[PDB]
Amino acid sequence: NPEALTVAATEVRRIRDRAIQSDAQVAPMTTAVRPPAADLVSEKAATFLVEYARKYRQTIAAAAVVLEEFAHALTTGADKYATAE
Amino acid sequence: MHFEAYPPEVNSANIYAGPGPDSMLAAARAWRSLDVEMTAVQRSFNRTLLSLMDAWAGPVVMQLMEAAKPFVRWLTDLCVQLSEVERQIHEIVRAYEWAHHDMVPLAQIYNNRAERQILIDNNLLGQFTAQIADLDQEYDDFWDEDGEVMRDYRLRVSDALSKLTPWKAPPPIA
Amino acid sequence: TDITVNVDGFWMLQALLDIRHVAPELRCRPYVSTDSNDWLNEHPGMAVMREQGIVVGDTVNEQVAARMRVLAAPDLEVVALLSRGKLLYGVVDNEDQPPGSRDIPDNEFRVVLARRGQHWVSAVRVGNDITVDDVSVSDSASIAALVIDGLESIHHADPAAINAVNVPLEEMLEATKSWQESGFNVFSGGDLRRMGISASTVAALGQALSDPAAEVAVYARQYRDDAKGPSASVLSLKDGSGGRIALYQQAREAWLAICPATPQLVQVGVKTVLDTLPYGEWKTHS
């Protein structure tokens, strides 16, 4: 059955779009953390959280690529059986 | 970070200045929505794979799940980490609020110094010398108290951050 | 038998031995217990103290550590602040002095005599160096002799030629403040004379207060359970053109004694400081 592979490819790309959209929606807040005070502890906390947000965005961009390569494989594998007639 | 080496004017002024924890609280609400959204992503992904396994249930698909497993477990691990971020940001905000509260107010420090100079300005006959030394001990007490408050603040913040483990790269599927 | 460390080194010994504060007059950095004292091993002063044997590995020489424990929790503290010139009571007047500076004025020498049980220890700070050692202290006279010896080591002076007198303290401070405000004008000594102070005493006093060559302030502190208290009276010695004068309150609103700094009256003044301590007999107390 090739039509199921096409359906999965469509849902994977939808899921990818959600991951990408939620990351982008909240990035202005997660990367805008400021130290609540001028001491070094407050700075170490805010700096950690900004970098932690930034590395999360990279991790998600990488996950978006894994999902798109998965949808592509699903579509390519579906066109291997729908024309194999 | 050995803040006990800095005088109370420094530690007290540093914690009282700044914009407060609002930007931290806004980020906790944001991280918390990511947790909600990515739990939905994880649930939809598992469901997508199970529907495909149901609509064909053959060797071709059973091998796609095997090549997908590493990503699926990665996605589970990501959900656990996401749920921790908001919790630890609020632990940090509380640490800051307790540091702010327990730190000696600058006014007390200024008043100590001001009272000391009034005794100096009237110590020609030396009969306030001992009370001057008492005021020096109180200032050292302020120094010690601020050092203790920053110690505990650093340790609470250090513990909260230690629980935010590094994001790992997602494995490939195809 | 004695040792000398800079202010940094004295603070490390406090850390190695978990001593929070010593006498404030030594003006050392307070030590605050944390999760680690290993960052102390990075200070250069640590290896310097390892060479003198003060610290063997990570353990402080036990004779020295015994002396630090007296300073750390004494039953009795006797303090003497000595100056060449006017005594500034710790004030270094440079507006580039950082907050909480541990410096002391270059003209100031600070002597703390601590007792625990019968163990008498000496802590003396000059510049940025502190010297710790045992000290033989028996009666008021031994303390008086130690102060005088420290004072003469700065500037020699003979007892001023004045007539001893007791004056009301609050009236005296008010009249002394006005006299200072007038510049110590020879015509403004009126209300000091009207208090019964001799024309000779007024002249020597004005010289000692106006342009001293050396001063000493001596006072004491006693400790019970966790409460503390200073001597109600302070002994001030001052060296003016007209000789060395001694000022102190007598056991008691209060009365200030104005005396020539005779070895006997300096002994009387030290005793009067110790007998105004709040918790009674100073030679024996815990």
Ligand SMILES: [Cl-]
């Ligand atoms: Cl909170």
Ligand SMILES: [Cl-]
């Ligand atoms: Cl991860």
